[PDB]
Write an enzyme that holds these catalytic residues in place. Structure first.
Site, mmCIF file in Angstrom:
data_model
loop_
_atom_site.group_PDB
_atom_site.id
_atom_site.type_symbol
_atom_site.label_atom_id
_atom_site.label_comp_id
_atom_site.label_asym_id
_atom_site.label_seq_id
_atom_site.Cartn_x
_atom_site.Cartn_y
_atom_site.Cartn_z
ATOM 1 C CG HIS A 197 0.723 8.122 -23.341
ATOM 2 N ND1 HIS A 197 0.615 6.727 -23.492
ATOM 3 C CD2 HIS A 197 1.277 8.082 -22.101
ATOM 4 C CE1 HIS A 197 1.021 6.141 -22.518
ATOM 5 N NE2 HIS A 197 1.364 6.924 -21.699
ATOM 6 C CG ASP A 240 5.040 7.748 -35.457
ATOM 7 O OD1 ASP A 240 4.310 7.643 -36.627
ATOM 8 O OD2 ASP A 240 6.002 7.280 -34.968
ATOM 9 N NE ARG A 258 2.180 4.727 -32.243
ATOM 10 C CZ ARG A 258 1.501 4.292 -31.063
ATOM 11 N NH1 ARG A 258 1.652 3.232 -30.259
ATOM 12 N NH2 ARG A 258 0.556 5.071 -30.858
ATOM 13 N N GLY A 272 0.077 -3.316 -23.207
ATOM 14 C CA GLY A 272 0.458 -2.093 -23.094
ATOM 15 C C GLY A 272 -0.335 -1.062 -23.549
ATOM 16 C CD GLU A 292 5.631 -9.021 -18.028
ATOM 17 O OE1 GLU A 292 4.833 -8.135 -17.364
ATOM 18 O OE2 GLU A 292 6.764 -8.568 -18.582
ATOM 19 C CD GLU A 297 4.911 1.192 -29.750
ATOM 20 O OE1 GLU A 297 5.992 0.659 -29.037
ATOM 21 O OE2 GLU A 297 4.738 2.396 -29.321
ATOM 22 C CD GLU A 312 15.064 1.957 -22.328
ATOM 23 O OE1 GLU A 312 14.662 2.191 -21.047
ATOM 24 O OE2 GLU A 312 14.907 3.124 -23.187
ATOM 25 C CG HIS A 339 8.092 7.175 -31.836
ATOM 26 N ND1 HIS A 339 7.143 6.363 -32.378
ATOM 27 C CD2 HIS A 339 8.574 6.292 -31.070
ATOM 28 C CE1 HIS A 339 6.846 5.316 -31.620
ATOM 29 N NE2 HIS A 339 7.954 5.158 -30.809
HETATM 30 N N1 LIG Z 1 6.049 -5.186 -18.927
HETATM 31 C C1 LIG Z 1 4.884 -4.419 -18.825
HETATM 32 N N2 LIG Z 1 3.566 -5.028 -18.609
HETATM 33 C C2 LIG Z 1 2.503 -4.299 -18.832
HETATM 34 N N3 LIG Z 1 2.658 -3.097 -19.358
HETATM 35 C C3 LIG Z 1 3.703 -2.323 -19.580
HETATM 36 C C4 LIG Z 1 4.736 -3.142 -19.559
HETATM 37 N N4 LIG Z 1 5.893 -2.483 -20.012
HETATM 38 C C5 LIG Z 1 5.445 -1.390 -20.488
HETATM 39 N N5 LIG Z 1 3.910 -1.241 -20.226
HETATM 40 C C6 LIG Z 1 2.998 -0.320 -20.566
HETATM 41 O O1 LIG Z 1 2.726 -0.233 -22.003
HETATM 42 C C7 LIG Z 1 2.631 0.718 -22.711
HETATM 43 C C8 LIG Z 1 3.565 0.730 -24.022
HETATM 44 S S1 LIG Z 1 3.534 2.237 -24.965
HETATM 45 C C9 LIG Z 1 1.798 2.482 -25.195
HETATM 46 C C10 LIG Z 1 1.635 2.548 -26.735
HETATM 47 C C11 LIG Z 1 -0.047 2.552 -27.051
HETATM 48 N N6 LIG Z 1 -0.493 1.214 -27.466
HETATM 49 C C12 LIG Z 1 -0.584 3.489 -27.812
HETATM 50 O O2 LIG Z 1 -0.505 3.311 -28.815
HETATM 51 O O3 LIG Z 1 -0.674 4.811 -27.353
HETATM 52 C C13 LIG Z 1 3.476 1.994 -21.711
HETATM 53 O O4 LIG Z 1 2.129 2.820 -21.716
HETATM 54 C C14 LIG Z 1 3.466 1.116 -20.658
HETATM 55 O O5 LIG Z 1 2.915 1.953 -19.212
#
Ligand SMILES: Nc1ncnc2c1ncn2[C@@H]1O[C@H](CSCC[C@H](N)C(=O)O)[C@@H](O)[C@H]1O
Ligand SMILES: Nc1ncnc2c1ncn2[C@@H]1O[C@H](CSCC[C@H](N)C(=O)O)[C@@H](O)[C@H]1O
Lengths: 319, 317, 317, 319
Positions: free
Chosen positions: C9, C15, C18, C42, C93, C107, C116, C257
């Protein structure tokens, strides 16, 4: 103090303008209010003007007097202080030409106006002229997201601490600052005009020139206007000497005779190319001597992107 | 009272070196603040009071005679320091506190270190409000000087007055030499070793010591070397703590908002590499105007290209 | 699940491009957020949910399946968005909301844009959770590719395996070509025009479209130019609003990144300015291992110094 | 996965060390746990060792086998997976030399140790040796105020928002990262040592090798220690062949056989040059297979600047 006058000697626009006025000045008396370093005052004296009374409040006039004495100019006398405090010492008290830039950032809020009006009512001959005699205000829309970020959101966090109270102080203040061309994103709109012969006196009430006028500009491109900027022009029209007229014009994004003033819109106005940004400008003078002014601004889109109207009161001060 | 406007506080806070110097001076020596009473003389927005609180101070007193104190009191509250930082609106000379303060933090430095500076106020606070061993942040102030070439401004700020629209404004040129210039000196302009001008121990200095005399020598380095002016800068070491931090306004560092003070010599020195010129500077508060600075400068230079022994005066007003 | 650790994080928040890209995408289009429901797929630390709140959203919903959601819920409260931002801990989901959301921010991009990546999760949120006119942040995604010279790594990563302490590890050299390299490509290495690899409209793209075929040509620009590898980068435009913002990982911009993905060609291409080499890339998730990417690359080059028509496979694992 | 082995082929220290051990190996059997790419394994097989059984969980062993087969080495056999899962197919199960770097960042927290001990108890010949056989942990005080600012205070405000909860996550995590020499500001204290012959088994309980040891260093200069750093060394002493001994030594600030780990002291410890920084180190293994470890440190000054004692618990994980 001396360095502060360099801008004046490099002001080619004012120099050619006031030179055009000082052609027919031979044999005529000149009263220069706000003479500053007295460059135009001395040019008038060098133009064989009968008498030149130059007045200003800064100490530079003392140096100006010295310079005048050291250049053989014997028809000019400088006076330091407010006009009211020096008229009693004036050698002559009726002038044919009165040069005074009495226009403020909003036309009616320059403290020098109070002196110009005095000179108009008491120190001006029957057929005398005043220069400049008219001034208009022009409105443009400005889009500077980064400036807002650097002056408003900057206070969101300062070395780890939130300084929200400062944001208010930023948005309530009229910003006098050159605005880059890249940030000008709308057409220009002449909203109001004042003429020294019509301007009302301020010795009783300071509001006798307050005005409320509409305006409308057109976005030059898909943009989001978050600032309104106001430019001041000046005009001199002499019916007896039509050729000596001039215009200190306005060119947003470029060199202007006065630094434009800006107000930050509390809600940005997203606009399509060609979309009209309509609004209203209300200007009220509260203190003629200190130029204390309130500027109420209403601005709205036309709805192409979204119907938004934003209002804001802003404060300007000279002293 | 112009500090009631946001522009000046923004400028100072965006002066990263200045603010981080105070921050790191306190935070790299946080042990010095535990259970201590801190006085922020001229707290402004409260930034330094919060640095002190975050360093572990028991009680912080930010004083400021400007209306910005109101906003400061609100800022202090917005970050949770309401019960550690107290914001007083008033002059530090005209206020009284419950306890004597253990630490005094203040950005009292002005242009030339002493022009329109609050140093007299800080010393007043030190003597009347501070413990006998009260620690000063900063506790040292050193002024340094070096010769510089400045053909640009000599031509654009002095010779420009020789002719203005066919009028002789030489008098303006002579008056320009009286007023120092606050501006940024570039490293390429320094044609001289940085010499110590004067040093003050804020723990022990008295107002009378601020009217100082200094005798310094300048040696030309790295073929005609012109010393058109003297660049004066300062640094304020924070030596009260175990870790030493130094706020520096030197031209060899990125500019601060103090930039540098340039005393343009009435007669520039025409030196060669290795030659030395001696100087005697006397700075004193202006007789009639207390907050204006009179500067007397004696220049004694004898080199293969010039022999000049003259006295010049400057007035920072 | 490694997102319960602070390092990733911090990397993403440090970054600047971003985070400010998302920040600005919202704050230059704040009109889009007034009285609207935002879903932050996320949310991680919640940074984007707070951007949306400050933009004027009536309600923001940050979902994250990792433990970081706990800190996120505390962060949103520490800044006063408790009544606007709701933090849910779980998979997008596997969660359902009261209202249909008007805006979806996330993101989701990984290395190579799709390795991934959460794109499938975002498409699921778009279909099931958002209004029919739901707006995506970002709503576009574009991958680009260009040839590069990399003599350094060709000698330090591939040819170094020829002889190791008297042992022939050439097999390791042959295996190295299978593994893409996530690293920064400097402008000095780019010897080719940036060509469009593939484009996705997040408003309409389906998971099946992410297994994509692309036919792109690469032309050498400005001795013998070696295309040792292909640099692949991406950009995600925020075009949902009136003011367009673009997050970009191109090598002509300071590194993010994500840096750049480098597919080393088994047979480097010997070109000189003007020559044109055509490529056909098929990228799809590995049949068995879902979250690994299989990249088939057909290189067809006919130049004055080489004639090669070969197929190479890369596995992003 | 192939790139991850470049560090091995360039590690000349380990390389010459293990080569010294593999001189007298002709006619003797070797078991290489954690063989990785199997470079040492093949060097032993090429030395006419009777049998060489190399094991590792990563697929690189499959590649290693290919290399071994293409270089004519037939007295070597590679096995993928946990030792316990592959001994069933070993050609020989009694070895004269067992090479295994079982030591972790805190001596007892490497999962490979569980296999090393198994090999010690079942797969070691009567007079067979294990290489390396001893490992020590060294403590140094570290001063990095900027690293604390960049990792802890950074969360003070992130794009205008305060992320205080994150600060905790930073300071309770053991950081594995090389520390610059300029940040090493104290002597080195050899705090603990473990020998493979003395290490207790982990099948029943995982805490039979936890250790609590004191440490004491002297500041090399006036400094403020805000990090404690831990370096690992290894030693092999063979009584039968004393000349083949070696030491994978340690040198803070320089190259080392393992990347040091560091813990952030919650309160900086100001020290004068030569002052003694004393303290206590407690290491506890919670999960051998995943290398989950807790590291508790107490650290204090001698008061020359100020009497401060700081304590902190930190978490480390391998998988
Ligand atoms: N299938 C899924 N459902 C829900 N959350 C998810 C997921 N796959 C990944 N994530 C979560 O989504 C996040 C993406 S990275 C987080 C980026 C954040 N917006 C920032 O700028 O700090 C991760 O912390 C992960 O825990
Ligand atoms: N005699 C006096 N007594 C008290 N406060 C004074 C003073 N003279 C000046 N000040 C105040 O001291 C402040 C100094 S500038 C503020 C600097 C601030 N600490 C910062 O780092 O941002 C001004 O805001 C001014 O209002």
């Amino acid at each position: 103090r001396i360095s502060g006058n360099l801008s004046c000697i490099h002001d080619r626009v004012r120099l050619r303008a006031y030179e055009s006025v000082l052609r027919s000045i031979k044999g005529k008396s000149v009263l220069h209010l706000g003479c500053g370093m007295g460059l135009v005052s001395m040019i008038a004296a060098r133009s064989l003007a009968s008498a030149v009374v130059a007045v200003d409040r800064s100490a530079i006039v003392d140096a100006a007097q010295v310079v005048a004495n050291k250049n053989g100019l014997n028809n000019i006398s400088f006076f330091r202080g407010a006009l009211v405090d020096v008229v009693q010492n004036f050698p002559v008290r009726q002038f044919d030409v009165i040069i005074c830039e009495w226009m403020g950032p909003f036309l009616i809020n320059d403290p020098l106006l109070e002196e110009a009006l005095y000179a108009r009512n008491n120190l001006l001959a029957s057929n005398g002229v005043m220069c400049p005699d008219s001034s208009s205000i022009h409105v443009v829309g400005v889009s500077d997201y980064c400036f807002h970020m650097d002056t408003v959101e900057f206070w969101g966090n300062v070395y780890g601490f939130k300084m929200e109270p400062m944001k208010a102080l930023v948005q309530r203040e009229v910003e006098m600052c050159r605005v880059p061309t890249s940030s000008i994103v709308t057409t220009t709109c002449l909203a109001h005009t004042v003429n020294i012969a019509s301007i009302n006196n301020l010795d009783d009430k300071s509001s006798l020139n307050d005005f409320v006028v509409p305006f409308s500009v057109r976005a030059t491109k898909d943009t989001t206007v978050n600032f309104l900027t106001f430019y001041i022009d000046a005009r001199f029209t002499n019916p007896h000497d039509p050729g000596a007229n001039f215009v200190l014009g306005v060119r947003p994004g470029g060199t202007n005779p006065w630094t434009e003033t800006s107000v930050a819109l509390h809600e940005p106005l997203p606009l399509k190319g060609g979309e009209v940004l309509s609004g209203e400008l209300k200007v009220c003078l509260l203190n003629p001597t200190r130029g204390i002014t309130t500027v109420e601004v209403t601005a709205r889109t036309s709805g192409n992107v979204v119907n938004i109207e934003t209002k804001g009161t802003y404060n300007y001060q000279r002293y | 009272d112009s500090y009631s406007h946001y522009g000046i506080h923004m400028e100072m806070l965006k002066d990263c070196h200045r603010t981080t110097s105070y921050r790191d001076a306190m935070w790299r020596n946080a042990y010095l603040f535990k259970d201590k009473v801190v006085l922020d003389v001229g707290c402004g927005t409260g930034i330094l009071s919060m640095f002190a609180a975050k360093a572990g101070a028991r009680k912080v007193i930010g004083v400021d005679c400007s209306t910005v104190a109101v906003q400061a009191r609100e800022i202090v509250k917005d970050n949770g320091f309401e019960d550690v930082i107290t914001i007083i609106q008033g002059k530090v000379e005209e206020i009284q506190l419950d306890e004597k303060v253990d630490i005094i933090i203040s950005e009292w430095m002005g242009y030339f270190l002493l022009y329109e500076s609050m140093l007299n106020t800080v010393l007043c606070a030190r003597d009347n409000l501070g413990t006998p061993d009260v620690k000063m942040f900063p506790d040292k102030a050193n002024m340094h000087v070096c010769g510089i070439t400045d053909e640009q401004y000599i031509q654009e700020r002095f010779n420009i007055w020789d002719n203005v629209q066919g009028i002789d404004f030489s008098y303006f040129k002579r008056l320009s030499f009286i007023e120092p210039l606050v501006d940024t000196v570039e490293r390429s302009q320094i044609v001289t070793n940085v010499a110590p001008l004067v040093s003050f121990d804020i723990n022990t200095v008295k107002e009378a010591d601020l009217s100082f005399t200094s005798e310094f020598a300048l040696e030309a380095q790295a073929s005609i070397i012109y010393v058109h002016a003297l660049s004066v800068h300062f640094d304020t070491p924070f030596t009260a703590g175990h870790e030493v931090v130094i706020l520096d306004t030197t031209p060899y560092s990125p500019p601060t908002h103090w930039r540098q003070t340039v005393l343009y010599l009435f007669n520039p020195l025409r030196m060669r590499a290795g030659e030395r010129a001696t100087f005697r500077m006397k700075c004193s508060p202006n007789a009639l105007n207390g907050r204006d600075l009179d500067i007397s400068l004696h220049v004694d230079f004898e080199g293969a290209l010039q022999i000049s022994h003259y006295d010049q005066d400057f007035r920072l007003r």
